Amino acid sequence: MQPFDSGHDDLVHDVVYDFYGRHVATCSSDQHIKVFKLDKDTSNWELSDSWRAHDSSIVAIDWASPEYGRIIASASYDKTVKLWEEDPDQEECSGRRWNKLCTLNDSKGSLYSVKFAPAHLGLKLACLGNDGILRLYDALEPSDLRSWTLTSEMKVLSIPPANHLQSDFCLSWCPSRFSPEKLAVSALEQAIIYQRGKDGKLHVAAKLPGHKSLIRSISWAPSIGRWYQLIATGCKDGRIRIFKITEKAELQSNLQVELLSEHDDHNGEVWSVSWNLTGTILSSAGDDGKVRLWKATYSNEFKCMSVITA
Amino acid sequence: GLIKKVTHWSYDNLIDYLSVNPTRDEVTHYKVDPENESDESIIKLHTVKDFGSITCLDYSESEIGMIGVGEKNGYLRIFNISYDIRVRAKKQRCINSLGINTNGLIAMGLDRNKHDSSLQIWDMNYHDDSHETINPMFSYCTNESIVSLKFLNDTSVLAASTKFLKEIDVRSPNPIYQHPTRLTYDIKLNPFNDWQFSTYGDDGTLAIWDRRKLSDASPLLTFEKLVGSGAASRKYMNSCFRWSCVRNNEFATLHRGDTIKRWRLGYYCDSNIENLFVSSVHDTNTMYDRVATFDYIPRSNNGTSLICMRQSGTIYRMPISEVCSKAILNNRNSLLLSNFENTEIDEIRVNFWKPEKLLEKDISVIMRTRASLGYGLDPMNTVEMIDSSNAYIRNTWRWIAIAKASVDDGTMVSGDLDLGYEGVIGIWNGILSDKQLNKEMEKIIKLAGSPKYVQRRLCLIISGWDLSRSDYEDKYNIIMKNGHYEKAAAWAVFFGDIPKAVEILGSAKKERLRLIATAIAGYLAYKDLPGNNAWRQQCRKMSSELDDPYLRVIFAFIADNDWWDILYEPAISLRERLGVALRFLNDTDLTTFLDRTSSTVIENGELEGLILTGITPNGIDLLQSYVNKTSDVQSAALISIFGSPRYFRDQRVDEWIQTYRDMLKSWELFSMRARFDVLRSKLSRTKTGVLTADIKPRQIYIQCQNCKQNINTPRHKYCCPHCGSSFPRCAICLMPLGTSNLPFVINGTNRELVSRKLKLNEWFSFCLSCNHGMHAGHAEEWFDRHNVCPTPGCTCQCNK
Ligand SMILES: [Zn+2]
Ligand SMILES: [Zn+2]
Ligand SMILES: [Zn+2]
Ligand SMILES: [Zn+2]
């Protein structure tokens, strides 16, 4: 383990890799976005740019597909999503290396999660805040990447939560070019899979059962070529639920969800859950201070292999 | 119990604290070192014991040691710990609150009296020392009961009564505002933003306020029943709610003496008053139960520790663990850990299992290493790569090499039937006529003792076992040179030449092998004696106990002579098992063996079953089970491209191909992706010659200058097909584009590499933002000194 200081003056909220795995973007509550590049020679993380982004705390950022250029989304609590494009004709560590493209002033609530759709669906976005409204923003005009149009507006929650009650939201797209467009949307205690229908509008497709408490993280496993998809969920309970999905009104394919496993090893709240490139190693963080690594056995049962204390 | 954090006193890293015992009788001054997490870091310094019943406590920031203590009888005592004066109001009554300003001004909150002020503000330097009573400089809040107060500035004080909440400035006799609210109790200003304070009420309802909203009036937040109730009845209440002195927008609440909830808030500006809402709550279980009051301990690197006082009065120190907030995985199997407390980010590179060992043994980094090493492009190269640094992958790539060499040599592709990369099951099991397939198989062979001899010859051709005695001797010599004497002896027994096996294994180095050969020698006479006689018994026991699979095979065949004990264990090559089931077996039992082994390998997902199944739809099912077992989509794709789109079309092969191409892009192996694409194009050639691969479509459709139509609806001179007119000229030399053998050498900025560069520099090249064409060498030589398009009248920096 080699710890490197990101340099923020407050709590680092979200860290995301790029597609090539050599750039990391860190957002924080100090109203800053920092992009770190992995040097090939020194093999140490070094800062590329650090610029003020929002007027409130940034909680979710995402890299775009590398075939659409280098675009970083940024969803903060000031009801804005800002899209940032790199112009390489600027000096590093200056604040002008990443140029602003567009502000999405349509969300009436503090945004929690932002996600890009896979590259075969176009340059799409997915926003979710405490207003309970799922918004999809496309990029229709190819001449300028500043005219982003809202296309799908689906309501996840009937009424927004009060300010004193906590809430958490998370999103996960479907990394499958050979399956129709799917979207895993995590409400307060609900997990909904949304599928693109024949009419061009999203519809409710399946619901993941369980989840007696707040869902803290959702993650769709990469389809390496298997016939069943995997969704990993980390709840406010100690459960790392892994859902096995088999795909076969106005929907191109009906899909069935069966719970594959349920692990209580963390003894707390599973804050984050993630997947590998091939869907073989899961990583789960919890209140025990330990990050557990899960791999499937021969009998399709996930068993912990390493525990990393901190 | 009251633990109050006191700052502006110590000059070292120590943080001072003041404590009141749960029986409300003494005031204790502590000193806590934050960098040491032991319970011995708390140092008890002094204890003033002459107190009746403490109700409130306050300290002085400017002067070190000056501590005021209120009491229920009415005696306020101002003294030092690191003089001693007792003061009281003109009309004696209980003291609820107390405040000492920075400039030494002292305020006081009293009970309700109809002839006296409950907010007495006075200075101790202008106080007559001969009287216990105080003469106040400023008197406020007559006929009221002030329960909590706090000095905001050097002149303004924020006082809370039983039915009002006021901010009173000493420079004006009229208060700034009065907001009627019932949540008027212990005021804790936010140390990072003075405009925010938080009180609670009699019903336990906590409320975080903003002074500007009250100035102008709703509370900014309201938590129903968060703290202990009964605030009016009891004057000795523990502090179970604290603001955060380590970071902004945070507060800790202690619930039931067991857990501390660290609520973290989020803010947004409606556009300067920040509206607040709850973002995350973190629960920390205490080390010891029954905790009444608690307080923070700021440490280095944004750390947090909590000093807590139990109901028995024991004071201890408890740290806050580093809980990971984000664990993300890379394509290179790299873990990145983000904490909820500090700022630093932890990384475990690939460079109970160890985490580094698991991420180094995962199939993602295995596939990355193989793809960087050049896996799948040439099967002989894969065999050499596997041998140079598990073994079933080598055995299933040896068959791919054999079948590919046989197809590329034209041995199989002749006749009306293709039969390339066909399986033993399909060949031996038959399926436009039986006579037609028999005669075409005969014409393939022309290049018994059984009804189907030509099928056996086809199976030996497919398996690569169609060999003569000289070929077997050459194989023995090759395996002897490679150093696997056990494998050489096993192959010699597979052919059936046991004296040859004895001769091969005896001419070795290792005495262990010479002993093994000596044991095997026995059989050269122990052939006509069917009976238990120890030698067979010991040989069966040794076949059970030896570790080498080939030696296990050789002993199980020598003793208790039976072919079935050789061709059922999976420890040896399936190609070798087919070689011994095709050379010495009856056709009645060969069908049973083939059916059992095929039905085994198809559901097990082993790659060695490609011997039996070939590159067929059943082979695609086998590869699908292999993927479901291992997620080795790299080997699945590199095996599937050997005849999936050439012979059929299934969605699973295209899915594996696209997945491997995306992974190769993610590892930045663009050269290997290009090699995979050209291999897919080369292996999709049909028997006629028609390509079946879904190649990349065209990206350039040049419009002709003369005819004004598409030129794509000549290896050295490209012209428009509609009218013959050539391409647009270069912008540097005004010569036509797309033609080689130029009368000059474009020397743009190992002589073979230089010649390739000189012949590459004369290619087509155009900017996609202004549409002006150049030679490649012309652009390379021209953009090293200029930064504008060379065409006149164009303003476009084509370099960047
Ligand atoms: Zn033309
Ligand atoms: Zn030219
Ligand atoms: Zn130009
Ligand atoms: Zn240009």
Side-chain angles (χ1 to χ4, degrees), chain A residues 2 4 6 14-15 17 21-22 43 56 112 163 166 224 226-227 272 274 276 278 280 283 295 305-306, chain B residues 267-268 277-278 281 326-328 330 333 338 343 345 347 349 352-353 355 362 364 628 631 633 665 668:
Chain A
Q2 49 273 16
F4 70 104
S6 67
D14 188 27
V15 178
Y17 272 94
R22 271 161 168 179
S43 290
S56 296
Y112 274 85
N163 50 3
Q166 66 177 356
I224 197 66
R226 304 175 275 240
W227 54 277
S272 71
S274 82
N276 212 1
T278 55
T280 56
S283 69
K295 290 187 65 164
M305 291 311 180
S306 172
Chain B
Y267 64 102
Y268 61 95
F277 72 103
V278 180
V281 185
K326 196 79 185 297
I328 44 173
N330 214 12
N333 271 329
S338 316
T343 314
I345 314 296
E347 164 64 36
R349 279 180 207 171
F352 282 166
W353 291 67
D362 200 37
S364 301
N628 289 331
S631 293
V633 77
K665 276 201 305 167
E668 293 196 26

Side-chain angles (χ1 to χ4, degrees), chain B residues 130-188:
Chain B
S130 72
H131 289 344
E132 272 175 349
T133 69
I134 44 180
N135 205 41
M137 284 167 61
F138 317 104
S139 302
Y140 295 107
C141 300
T142 75
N143 207 356
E144 271 182 352
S145 162
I146 288 296
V147 285
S148 68
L149 64 95
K150 186 74 94 161
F151 264 115
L152 303 171
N153 218 2
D154 284 335
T155 44
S156 66
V157 64
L158 186 74
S161 82
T162 180
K163 273 179 296 283
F164 265 101
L165 184 42
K166 310 162 273 299
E167 171 176 324
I168 311 189
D169 215 2
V170 301
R171 308 182 283 182
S172 163
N174 199 3
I176 307 188
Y177 50 86
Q178 296 190 5
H179 177 243
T181 181
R182 270 295 181 176
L183 317 169
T184 44
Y185 281 101
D186 302 359
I187 307 191
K188 309 210 170 58

Side-chain angles (χ1 to χ4, degrees), chain B residues 751-769:
Chain B
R751 216 187 173 182
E752 192 196 1
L753 177 86
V754 193
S755 68
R756 273 180 91 97
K757 180 73 171 288
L758 284 183
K759 191 165 175 58
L760 187 66
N761 276 335
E762 44 179 359
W763 287 1
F764 187 79
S765 176
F766 78 112
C767 165
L768 261 178
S769 285

